[PDB]
Design a protein around this nucleic acid. Structure first.
Length: 40
RNA sequence: UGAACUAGCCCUGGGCGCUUAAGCGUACUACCCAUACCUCACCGUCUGGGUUAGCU
């Protein structure tokens, strides 16, 4: 009755989740550096 | 008082027309338009880059 998600989907989701974390982490830093650069 | 000299125009030796030019010299602003220059679109060629746990 319950169809488990494919295991390749779980592996891709873990990889995509990690890549999104780096993008967001390097996006808040990008905003701060841009504000400091623009003042300079 | 003149004398010559110097330089330049005139005479003798594309068409229509032009004469303080529509010729010649110089200066100055306007204007005309090439397949050239600029901006854009499109064609093609070349060069460089991206694109797969193929993510509704």
């Amino acid at each position: 009755a319950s169809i488990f998600a494919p295991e390749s989907l779980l592996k891709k989701t873990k990889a995509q989740k990690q890549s999104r974390e780096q993008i967001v982490a390097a996006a808040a830093e990008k905003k701060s550096a841009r504000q400091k650069k623009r003042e300079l």
